[PDB]
Each structure stands twice: as structure tokens, then as C-alpha cells.
Amino acid sequence: FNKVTLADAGFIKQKFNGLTVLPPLLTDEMIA
Amino acid sequence: AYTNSFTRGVYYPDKVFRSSVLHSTQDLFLPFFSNVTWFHAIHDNPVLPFNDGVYFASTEKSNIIRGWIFGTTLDSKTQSLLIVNNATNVVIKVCEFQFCNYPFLGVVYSSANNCTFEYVSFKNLSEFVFKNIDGYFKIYSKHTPINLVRDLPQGFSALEPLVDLPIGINITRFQTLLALHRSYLTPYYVGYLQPRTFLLKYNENGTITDAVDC
Amino acid sequence: ALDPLSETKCTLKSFTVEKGIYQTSNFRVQPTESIVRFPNITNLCPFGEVFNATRFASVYAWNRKRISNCVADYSVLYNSASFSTFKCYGVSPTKLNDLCFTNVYADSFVIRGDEVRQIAPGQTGTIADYNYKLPDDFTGCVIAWNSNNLDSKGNYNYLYRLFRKSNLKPFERDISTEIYQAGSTPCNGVKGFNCYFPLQSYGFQPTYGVGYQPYRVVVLSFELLHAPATVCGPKKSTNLVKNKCVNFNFNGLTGTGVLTESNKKFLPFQQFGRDIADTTDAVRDPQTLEILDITPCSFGGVSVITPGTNTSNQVAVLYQGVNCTEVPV
Amino acid sequence: EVFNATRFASVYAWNRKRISNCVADYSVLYNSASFSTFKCYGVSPTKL
Amino acid sequence: LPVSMTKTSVDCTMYICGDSTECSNLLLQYGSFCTQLNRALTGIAVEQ
Amino acid sequence: SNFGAISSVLNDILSRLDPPEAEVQIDRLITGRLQSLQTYVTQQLIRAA
Amino acid sequence: SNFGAISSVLNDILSRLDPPEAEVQIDRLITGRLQSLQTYVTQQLIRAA
Ligand SMILES: *[C@@H]1O[C@H](CO)[C@@H](O)[C@H](O)[C@H]1NC(C)=O
Ligand SMILES: *[C@@H]1O[C@H](CO)[C@@H](O)[C@H](O)[C@H]1NC(C)=O
Ligand SMILES: *[C@@H]1O[C@H](CO)[C@@H](O)[C@H](O)[C@H]1NC(C)=O
Ligand SMILES: *[C@@H]1O[C@H](CO)[C@@H](O)[C@H](O)[C@H]1NC(C)=O
Ligand SMILES: *[C@@H]1O[C@H](CO)[C@@H](O)[C@H](O)[C@H]1NC(C)=O
């Protein structure tokens, strides 16, 4: 989890002209 | 009379605020590592050309230098702009002028013909950038402490515009003038800007950190 | 419009709908209280001088004037029927009373009425190519009217350049009276063969018919960049508000969203910031000078969840990413 | 055949010689000192 | 091995027009373009 | 991107012009942005595959 | 292919036309060539996958 980072993304890092990011159905806890 | 133009002489290209983001822009900028002329002020009044923009610089604490002449011919026949660092207030005006051979401020003399308008407003280095953009003569200025004896300080520093003058007069040449202790009428660094594409790194507080020449 | 279930039905273009979740609508709350801001400008610039002064220069040496720090009224201009010619290329005349331009250049000159056609973008001819050239992307309006009552007795003082070694670039002038080398034979002030004077006078005699008669011309150019303004329409400003979705106008630019005091330390020379998407995120008020942030009100995304219509008519609604405190609006 | 002819037509003596499908320059008459009048209206002579 | 990209969706009408009713009316002339695009992106989202 | 339009800010077009020409300018913006969305969506399908 | 333009030789339009009408014609040709490249790079991506 510490290796992959989104610090260089745009909207993914961050209203923004209708763009939207939906959460996955499975969160990281149940995947774990 | 020559030295390396280190990474300096950067200015805010626009009034738009940006922070903690990288941005690209195309505008007139003297490139890095270029040549800059140094003059034999150590012990004749000089004159120099103005190609597109002139990158001035000089170490001053007591304000020995008192402004710059700007113009196309400097022949008392066409409008030319004059800046005077008067002790009360700085003064700017453009008019035809009876330019003497040594028009230095003897202490004060000046001239004026067919005037259009007027406007009023070594420990530390002072530098200015002059852009004769179409219909707009943009002025930029800086004032920061230094430790170098004669060489330009390698530390980066970029800064905001002083003022913009709408005349946009023909500027083909420009001259330098300062004040002398006595009045005796008798018959610093310079660089040239070029059109380049620049990458600007804005950080928190909107402050420009550094840049990279394309 | 009856209910979300009905909305889902007409979205899927079917009466029956099976069990599932269907992205179907967007609830953009976006209330719009009206607010506007501009600087304290009251000085009316000398528009009448450029449009009513008796002394006007000729097209070969067309006059140029800068208009700034002034209130602008365009109703007086387009309502004045005296302007026989009135055209615009980058802005509609009615909208001029609502915008701000940051600077205005007022050009004026006199020409024969038949030559009025050349004053437009992309035009050609001696007037366009050798006396007064407009840029192809000109942003302004061209105004002209008959001037026989003033520029006609003939008034040969009005001169026009006929030729030059090359066509003039936009907003250029060439008052060089040097005789043109109109051929192989060189000349130094000799007005002989293939060596003619660069300018000629107009036969502005009132005996000539309309079109041939002199027409006065006025051209306005707008510096549309919007960082400084100080040049705005006659419309009055009003008190701003905070934390409410309002249609806002500052110095002519406009947008819609929530307003809040900006913590960003803008420099005094700055007026407004831009985000990653280059959209305005904050702005400097043109009356109090403080900086206030700008943010849209909400994504508004809405989806409907429901079992099969065969099974039941009950439905539930999901507001995508919206905080439950704001959904009642 | 016209600028160096030995006989010229009177005002009453109408003449219209046919010129077509040929390529020749006007520069000769444009720089002819004898042609005291080289006034043109339809296009600049340099467009020849 | 990658498993699933971040689910994304876009409001075609508001993105293209930014709540401009005039633009929306003009966009209606293109037909079902926005619906088809939304459908495709939704399919991708479900695929994740 | 302006796509040949006088400006990329739609509100400027709506405010600077009257509808009899703004529809044309808007049509140019519509074409450009729609093409961008089409390219983006197609690329997303391929990456999804 | 001219794509509805007066010609396909780019220099021909710029020679026969002045800048004002040339803009609309060259814009059409630009749109057509862009469309072709888009079709060329979309097929290549599929064939690469
Ligand atoms: C700088 O000036 C020196 C002379 O002092 C010259 O030899 C050199 O070519 C100039 N240019 C550069 C890039 O050094
Ligand atoms: C400015 O003057 C110079 C001659 O000193 C001339 O070569 C140049 O073309 C002029 N430019 C302008 C702004 O007209
Ligand atoms: C911005 O940042 C520093 C610390 O991050 C802060 O002390 C100061 O107010 C600002 N500095 C400049 C150069 O603007
Ligand atoms: C305009 O005037 C008001 C008082 O009437 C004052 O509070 C405000 O600061 C002024 N703003 C400007 C930009 O002059
Ligand atoms: C729903 O469908 C079932 C069969 O799956 C049927 O038996 C029942 O009558 C239907 N109810 C209706 C018509 O809503």
C-alpha cells in the first residue's frame, strides 16, 4: 500500500466539470 | 566585460495566481548561461542598443543610479521615455528632450518639448526587466541582499511587475544616466531578452521557485 | 417529473423495470441569487470628441486614442441613428453595455464613402493594404457616417496612400513622403517616369453624389484579457454574499458557485487564480480588494435503486458523494 | 507590330487586332521611356 | 497482475455544456450520443 | 482548447454574442469536445479490454 | 481526398485564396486528415491488442 501512490494525479488525487470517480464495490478491508 | 548569465532574471509572466503547480508559458526571457556585458565603471558615458527587451542589473544601497533613458534615436526630434529616481518620489515621463552629451543629474537639469503625459510614484542588488510589448511597456523590479563582490549571485530569485506604461513608444535604443556630486556639463550589467518557452514551478504562497529553459 | 420511479421508467424507455441500480438523472442544486461587482468608475470618457469633433485626420495618418479608467455607454452610440454604418465582428452591440474590456483604442479617419467596405477583417485594397489594415481576428466595432457637411466644400487636404513596397501589417502607419521607385529606373526626388508621389488627394466636392462624398469613420478595438478592467458598462454593482450559490460577475467575467473568503496570499498585482483545469478558483473583489474563493456547489449525481416493478413500486434514491446535510435543498 | 508599326489608325478607322494564346511581358512597355503614359486601372502592371 | 482500473463516469451533458441550456438544446440535435457514451462507461464500471 | 472558436469559455460566448451566431460558435465547441470524449471513451474501452 | 474542400494540394488553396476564405477551407481539410489519422490509430490499437 505504501509503494503505490496517487500524489501525481489530477482529479484522482483531488466540482471538476462533471468528472467523477466511483468507489469500488469491494473496499480494501474485505479484499484483505 | 563579460560573464555568465546565471539562472536569474525571471519574472511573473501574468497576473494570474498559481500555487503548488507546474505551468508552461512562451514569453520573452533572457536564456540561462547567456552572455551579459559588464562595463568599466572602475577608475566616458556609454550608450547601448535595445533589441527587443533589456535586462538591467546593478548593486545599489545609496541609489547612485537615477533611472534610464529609453527611445529610438535620442535626437530631440521624437518621443523618448525618461525615468528619474528623484529623492521625494520616482518620476516617469515621455516627451521630445534636448538631450545633452552628458545629461547626468548635476547637483538636476532636464528638458521638455511636446509632452504627452507624466506619471509619478551595494549591499543589495537591484535589477529591472524592460519589455516593449505592443502598446504596453512592462516594468519589473527586484531588491534583494547580496554577498558577491562583482559577479552576479548564482542564487535564483524571480519577482513581480513594478508597473506597465500604455504609450508603447518606438524603443530602438536606450542610454544610461546617474547623478554626480558636482554639476559639470562637458561634451552594472546589461542583457538581451529573447522569445523562449519556459516552465514555471509555483509553490505555496504563489512564490516562483525556479524554472527550466526549453 | 412525477417521481424517481417514473423518471427511471422514461429513461429506460420501458414501463417494466427489473431489479437493479440505474444511473438515471443529475440533481444539480445550483440556486442563483444575482450579485455583480465592478470598480467605482464614474468619469465618462470623451466619446463625443472622437464622434463629434470637427477636426479629424486622414486615413493615411489615421488618429489613435486610448480610452481607459471610464464608464462606457453604448446605448447612446447604437441608438444614434446618424451612424449610417454600424457593424461588429467579435461582440454583439447590445452586449457592449454589459462587458468590461481592460483598455479601448479609438481610431478615427476620413475616407470616401465607397471605400467604407474596406474597413473590415480580411478586406483588401489600397485603403486596407496601404492606409489602415485591421487584423484578421479583430475584436471590436466599426462606425462610420457621411461627412459631406464637414469634409466637403474640394477638400483636397484629405490624402490617401496609393502604394507602398509592401502591404501594411495590422495597425501600422507609413507617413514616409519619399517618392516610390515605381520601376527599374532609380530616382532621388525626381517625379519623372516610374517615380510618383506616394499620396493623392480626394475630390471631396459636395457636387458629387452620395457614396462618393466623404464619410467619417471611427473604429474601436478591445483588449480582451480581463486582468485589469477600469472600463465597464453602465450597469450598477451590488453587495456580494458568502456561502451561497450565486450567479456572480466580477470585472466582466462570470460564473456560478459558492463564495468564501480566500486564504491564498495573492500578491497585490494579482486579481484571480487558476486551478489545474485553468478555471477560476479565486478572485479579487473590484470594490473591497479582498480575495474570495470560488467553488461549484455540488456534483449532483443521482441514481435510483429499486426491485422489479413486477415485485413492488417502492424505490430509494442515492445521492452520489453528496453530504447528507446538503441534500434537502 | 503595333508599337513599332509604320502606319497608324485614325479615330474614324476602327481597328481591333486579335491577341490570344500567347505569352509576352508588359515590362518592355512598363519601362519604355517613350511611353510617356503608362496609367493603369484594372491591376498593377507588376501582376503581368 | 493488474485487476481493475479506477471506475470513472462522466455527465456528458453537463461536461459538454456546463449547465448552459442553450448549449444543451443544441446538443439535443446530435441525438443519443451522450446516452451511448454513458452506457459504455457504465459497462466498464460494472466490469471492474 | 478553442477549436477555432473565439474563446473556450462558453459563458463568454453566451455573453459576448447574441444567439444567431453563438449557436455556430457553440457548434464548433460542441464538435471539438464531443470528439475529445469519443477518443477518450474508445481508449478507455481498449484499456478495459 | 479533398473532404469537400476546393482541392487537396494544400499549397494550391493558399495560392488561389487569400487568408480569410482559406481558413474555412484549410479547416475542413484539417478536420478530414485528423479524422483519417484517428481511424488509422484506432484500427492499429485494435490490431495491436
Ligand atoms: C561571450 O563573450 C565572449 C567574449 O567575452 C565570447 O568569446 C563568447 O563567444 C560569447 N558567448 C558565449 C556564449 O560565451
Ligand atoms: C522604429 O524606428 C526604427 C529606426 O530607428 C525603425 O527601423 C523601425 O522600423 C521602427 N519601428 C516601428 C515601431 O515603427
Ligand atoms: C510561503 O511559505 C513559507 C513557508 O512555507 C512561509 O514562511 C512564507 O510566508 C512564504 N514564503 C514566501 C517566500 O512567500
Ligand atoms: C468604492 O466606494 C466605496 C464607498 O462608497 C468604498 O467602500 C470602496 O472601497 C470603493 N471601491 C473602490 C474600488 O474605489
Ligand atoms: C410477476 O411475475 C410472476 C412470474 O415471475 C407472476 O407470477 C406474477 O403474477 C407477476 N406479478 C405482476 C403481474 O406484477
Side-chain angles (χ1 to χ4, degrees):
Chain A
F1 271 52
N2 291 349
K3 272 280 184 182
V4 187
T5 52
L6 322 176
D8 56 2
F11 181 75
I12 292 153
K13 181 181 181 175
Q14 300 167 284
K15 282 278 283 297
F16 282 90
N17 297 114
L19 292 203
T20 56
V21 169
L22 291 167
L25 175 54
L26 301 163
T27 70
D28 292 321
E29 298 295 315
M30 316 164 283
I31 293 163
Chain B
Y2 282 81
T3 185
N4 176 281
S5 76
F6 290 93
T7 65
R8 58 168 51 264
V10 177
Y11 59 93
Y12 279 64
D14 192 0
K15 311 195 162 184
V16 170
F17 177 92
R18 300 192 182 86
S19 59
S20 301
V21 292
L22 300 189
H23 194 64
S24 166
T25 189
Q26 184 178 7
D27 189 358
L28 277 293
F29 299 107
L30 87 159
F32 302 157
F33 309 101
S34 306
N35 270 17
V36 290
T37 310
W38 182 84
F39 296 92
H40 58 281
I42 61 178
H43 194 298
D44 292 331
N45 284 276
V47 65
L48 302 168
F50 185 100
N51 313 130
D52 296 330
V54 147
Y55 176 52
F56 195 80
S58 186
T59 54
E60 298 290 319
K61 181 167 172 68
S62 305
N63 308 313
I64 297 89
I65 300 299
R66 308 295 182 79
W68 295 274
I69 307 299
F70 279 94
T72 187
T73 47
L74 282 72
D75 57 359
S76 303
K77 184 57 174 286
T78 185
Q79 294 300 320
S80 295
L81 177 71
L82 267 62
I83 294 176
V84 167
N85 304 170
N86 155 46
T88 299
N89 277 109
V90 293
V91 179
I92 302 97
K93 170 152 97 200
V94 69
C95 297
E96 293 177 350
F97 287 97
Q98 182 64 14
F99 288 123
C100 304
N101 194 250
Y102 295 174
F104 68 100
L105 195 161
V107 61
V108 175
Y109 61 91
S110 68
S111 52
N113 307 271
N114 278 359
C115 291
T116 65
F117 80 105
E118 180 174 304
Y119 169 63
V120 180
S121 171
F122 276 39
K123 300 290 190 177
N124 296 31
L125 183 76
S126 64
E127 55 263 51
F128 306 87
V129 174
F130 301 87
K131 296 206 296 183
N132 188 13
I133 306 302
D134 54 299
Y136 278 100
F137 189 61
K138 314 195 84 81
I139 313 303
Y140 306 80
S141 71
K142 293 104 177 170
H143 196 295
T144 55
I146 61 168
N147 305 91
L148 265 292
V149 59
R150 186 255 293 282
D151 210 278
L152 282 128
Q154 290 78 42
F156 190 85
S157 64
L159 188 147
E160 60 76 14
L162 175 61
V163 73
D164 189 16
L165 310 180
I167 36 153
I169 191 66
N170 186 340
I171 305 176
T172 311
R173 295 200 305 162
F174 83 106
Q175 207 161 17
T176 174
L177 85 158
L178 61 89
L180 300 184
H181 176 55
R182 308 298 192 182
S183 320
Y184 296 130
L185 278 69
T186 289
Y188 65 88
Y189 286 108
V190 168
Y192 301 103
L193 283 86
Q194 296 181 353
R196 300 290 182 103
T197 305
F198 268 49
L199 183 69
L200 277 292
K201 171 170 176 182
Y202 295 89
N203 81 337
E204 285 96 298
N205 289 337
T207 308
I208 286 165
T209 65
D210 59 343
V212 179
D213 301 356
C214 279
Chain C
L2 178 62
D3 62 358
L5 171 52
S6 311
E7 193 279 332
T8 307
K9 283 180 180 182
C10 67
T11 299
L12 300 177
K13 310 188 50 50
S14 59
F15 281 74
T16 52
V17 179
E18 71 280 16
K19 174 169 68 173
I21 172 156
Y22 305 98
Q23 185 64 60
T24 194
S25 85
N26 183 295
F27 185 59
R28 191 70 58 169
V29 164
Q30 263 62 8
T32 57
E33 160 63 68
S34 189
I35 57 158
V36 169
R37 306 288 275 185
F38 297 122
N40 300 5
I41 312 305
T42 60
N43 309 65
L44 185 69
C45 277
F47 302 105
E49 278 69 356
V50 295
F51 289 116
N52 237 349
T54 188
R55 183 65 273 172
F56 288 158
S58 51
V59 76
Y60 89 100
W62 53 272
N63 289 329
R64 185 167 193 91
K65 195 176 188 75
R66 221 188 76 261
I67 293 169
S68 65
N69 310 98
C70 275
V71 179
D73 191 325
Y74 302 94
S75 305
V76 166
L77 306 180
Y78 56 74
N79 294 348
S80 296
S82 297
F83 305 134
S84 59
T85 301
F86 187 84
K87 300 175 73 68
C88 301
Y89 304 94
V91 167
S92 291
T94 312
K95 306 303 193 185
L96 296 166
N97 285 317
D98 301 333
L99 310 174
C100 303
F101 301 146
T102 302
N103 181 85
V104 174
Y105 298 106
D107 296 335
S108 310
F109 47 85
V110 168
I111 49 164
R112 168 168 75 164
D114 299 339
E115 273 57 36
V116 72
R117 61 188 179 74
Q118 297 200 29
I119 316 309
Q123 279 286 333
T124 58
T126 56
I127 310 309
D129 310 333
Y130 296 125
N131 297 255
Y132 183 78
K133 187 69 173 184
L134 278 170
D136 303 315
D137 54 3
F138 167 68
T139 299
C141 301
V142 175
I143 297 173
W145 65 100
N146 194 349
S147 66
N148 195 63
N149 307 72
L150 275 294
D151 306 326
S152 191
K153 297 294 295 186
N155 280 113
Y156 300 110
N157 62 288
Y158 300 94
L159 313 182
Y160 50 99
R161 182 174 276 273
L162 280 295
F163 46 77
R164 187 177 171 268
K165 290 170 67 67
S166 184
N167 306 131
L168 299 178
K169 277 73 69 177
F171 304 108
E172 282 200 317
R173 276 200 206 82
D174 194 350
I175 58 172
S176 315
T177 55
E178 303 300 326
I179 52 153
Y180 179 62
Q181 197 199 335
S184 178
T185 183
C187 45
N188 311 85
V190 182
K191 308 180 191 291
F193 184 61
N194 294 338
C195 294
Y196 318 121
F197 190 65
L199 319 177
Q200 305 283 267
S201 56
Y202 276 121
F204 289 145
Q205 191 69 26
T207 51
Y208 280 106
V210 71
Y212 203 110
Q213 282 169 20
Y215 291 11
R216 267 162 181 211
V217 180
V218 176
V219 178
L220 297 181
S221 183
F222 312 141
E223 187 181 2
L224 302 196
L225 59 80
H226 302 57
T230 82
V231 165
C232 282
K235 53 157 61 183
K236 197 206 174 188
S237 300
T238 186
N239 290 311
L240 60 82
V241 298
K242 308 280 166 47
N243 313 95
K244 177 167 178 176
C245 302
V246 304
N247 284 349
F248 54 86
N249 192 326
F250 303 93
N251 310 68
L253 56 76
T254 179
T256 307
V258 180
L259 302 176
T260 294
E261 287 77 1
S262 189
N263 69 287
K264 304 192 182 192
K265 291 186 179 186
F266 280 29
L267 274 289
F269 79 104
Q270 299 173 314
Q271 283 74 33
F272 60 94
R274 287 187 187 267
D275 65 349
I276 296 289
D278 201 60
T279 63
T280 309
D281 69 331
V283 69
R284 175 161 260 149
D285 179 77
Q287 300 191 338
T288 191
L289 279 294
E290 281 74 43
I291 318 310
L292 72 165
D293 289 333
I294 296 169
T295 56
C297 306
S298 179
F299 279 110
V302 168
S303 301
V304 170
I305 61 187
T306 179
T309 56
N310 163 278
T311 326
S312 182
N313 293 299
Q314 286 290 349
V315 302
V317 184
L318 166 58
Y319 287 79
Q320 293 143 230
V322 191
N323 187 356
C324 289
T325 51
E326 285 73 357
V327 67
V329 185
Chain D
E1 289 78 2
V2 173
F3 308 129
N4 304 82
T6 60
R7 176 259 168 193
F8 321 126
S10 307
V11 165
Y12 168 79
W14 285 91
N15 78 299
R16 282 282 157 83
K17 184 157 279 182
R18 176 80 296 157
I19 301 103
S20 192
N21 61 86
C22 59
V23 185
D25 68 276
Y26 303 157
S27 88
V28 169
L29 281 291
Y30 165 71
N31 301 123
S32 172
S34 307
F35 263 73
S36 296
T37 302
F38 201 83
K39 65 185 182 292
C40 187
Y41 316 95
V43 72
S44 171
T46 58
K47 211 66 58 172
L48 73 172
Chain E
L1 307 172
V3 172
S4 62
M5 64 183 73
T6 307
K7 293 165 68 176
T8 56
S9 66
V10 301
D11 186 311
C12 173
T13 302
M14 193 305 298
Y15 165 75
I16 287 296
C17 296
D19 313 293
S20 158
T21 57
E22 304 88 348
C23 172
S24 309
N25 294 345
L26 289 159
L27 182 56
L28 293 183
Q29 292 183 340
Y30 282 79
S32 67
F33 270 103
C34 284
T35 299
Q36 185 164 20
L37 298 155
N38 264 275
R39 190 169 289 156
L41 287 171
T42 306
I44 287 168
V46 170
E47 202 69 7
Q48 301 309 293
Chain F
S1 301
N2 57 55
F3 299 101
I6 64 183
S7 163
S8 56
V9 172
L10 176 51
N11 293 306
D12 297 359
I13 313 311
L14 288 160
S15 52
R16 284 166 57 169
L17 304 179
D18 188 73
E21 59 283 0
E23 84 287 22
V24 169
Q25 292 290 296
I26 287 158
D27 191 31
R28 282 190 197 156
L29 285 175
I30 283 293
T31 302
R33 288 171 179 193
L34 187 54
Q35 205 162 272
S36 300
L37 261 176
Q38 279 287 1
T39 300
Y40 169 70
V41 169
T42 299
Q43 178 93 359
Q44 283 293 82
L45 276 296
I46 289 152
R47 279 202 179 91
Chain G
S1 298
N2 58 57
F3 304 90
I6 58 173
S7 169
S8 67
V9 176
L10 183 63
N11 289 354
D12 186 18
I13 295 88
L14 292 161
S15 296
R16 294 183 181 277
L17 304 191
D18 57 358
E21 43 260 40
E23 287 289 327
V24 55
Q25 294 292 308
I26 198 161
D27 181 67
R28 280 186 71 87
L29 172 43
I30 283 164
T31 300
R33 283 168 177 195
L34 203 57
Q35 185 60 231
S36 297
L37 262 181
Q38 283 285 0
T39 322
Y40 161 71
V41 174
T42 294
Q43 278 199 28
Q44 284 295 94
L45 266 168
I46 297 169
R47 198 181 289 93

